[PDB]
Ligand binder design. Sequence first.
Ligand SMILES: O=C(O)CNC(=O)C(=O)O
Ligand SMILES: [Cl-]
Ligand code: NI
Ligand code: NI
Ligand code: NI
Ligand SMILES: [Zn+2]
Length: 474
Amino acid sequence: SVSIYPSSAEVLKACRNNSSILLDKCPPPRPPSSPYPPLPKDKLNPPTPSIYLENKRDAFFPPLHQFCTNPNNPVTVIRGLAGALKLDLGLFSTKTLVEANNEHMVEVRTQLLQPADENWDPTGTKKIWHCESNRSHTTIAKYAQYQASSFQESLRPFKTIKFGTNIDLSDDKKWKLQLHELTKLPAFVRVVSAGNLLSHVGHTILGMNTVQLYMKVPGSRTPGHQENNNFCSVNINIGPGDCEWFVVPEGYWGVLNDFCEKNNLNFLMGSWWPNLEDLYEANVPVYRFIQRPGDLVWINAGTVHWVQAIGWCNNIAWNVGPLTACQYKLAVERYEWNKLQSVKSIVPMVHLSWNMARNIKVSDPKLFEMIKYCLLRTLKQCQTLREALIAAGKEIIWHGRTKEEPAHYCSICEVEVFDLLFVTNESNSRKTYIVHCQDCARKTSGNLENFVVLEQYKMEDLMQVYDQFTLAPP
Ligand SMILES: O=C(O)CNC(=O)C(=O)O
Ligand SMILES: [Cl-]
Ligand code: NI
Ligand code: NI
Ligand code: NI
Ligand SMILES: [Zn+2]
């Protein structure tokens, strides 16, 4: 086993400046061109990779994990999952939810009921990409009343509907039985696991390493997106109705980004529902399937997808990050692309990478090299910044952090800010601690007159974590 990275002492000595240790100019991220080889028309409506579970033991069959994580499978539907594990989906019924926490908050998206797989402008004149979805907030009790009455009404120029989304099931004291039911899942889809990157973040990232619930009426749509930082997604349909999923492989996200732009929409932050006719003509394959109650949908890393309720149903969902080179690579790429687009990375990949280095014995050479490389780039960036401040006579205040303390982001550009926080004098005194990155601070004060610099980690500490992160035996 050959170490290809310099020691932390070597990195530090290099910053104190001769020959370079590495090329810090880095190729900047860009959306990929349409995959090669191109696909013919007869391969643009592929069947969905499926797993048909019958017994509890089937769910824990080891090859399951590998089938779902296989890059060639953009999505996997696991049929009969709830039944095989005898999960009580009743714990997630609207009735049970109302009884548990009837005043709990629900984000509401008001939309137009659209026909089938299509999206039309509000006048019904033509198909468009923009998906109208306006935000409000209500309680579970009040949305439950609406969901129930919507259904009763059905037993008896688009109509307006409301979609209960992003309902926060993070509090184990309000949702104890609900969250406990999910510990029955196999490790690779659990909300918390040693093999889940998001379990190593060290703090709560709502909806990713905590459970989110959806309450739906027919037509309730989640428009096109990739997960935050391209993390895999897990979704179980509670029922009683079905959901319909539309899926495009990760490699085509550049093509979809271009469609968005051509329709004057933002790919990452915009609200869009793809025109299937447009995709077909651009030779973009679409996986399309129905998720029944009890079925689990696994969305692979960076898979582009959008969803609509066909019936009345609830869903629960969260993210997982398999401990693989593929997942880490995609997460870092989106992290870098986000920076270029001034879009917030909900997963703080630097904070996480350093936690992975503290906690995880990485045995796979490719994944190990990616992480250690990240540690090298950021260790170097931190010491470079520290040396510049010291040379400019700017002092560094020890601030430290609590172990469960979240990563901080710039209040201006929303970039992750690691180890050295810039806070205005007023903000420091009032302990409001409004963080800025270096660049955004300097824009308002060239010499940082109006700012203090808080240090969260000892350099000795980072240096040790770096040196102690070594390829683990298989
Ligand atoms: O259930 C929905 O409407 C949307 N769900 C997802 O995007 C997901 O689970 O990844
Ligand atoms: Cl709003
Ligand atoms: Ni138990
Ligand atoms: Ni999703
Ligand atoms: Ni603090
Ligand atoms: Zn900034």
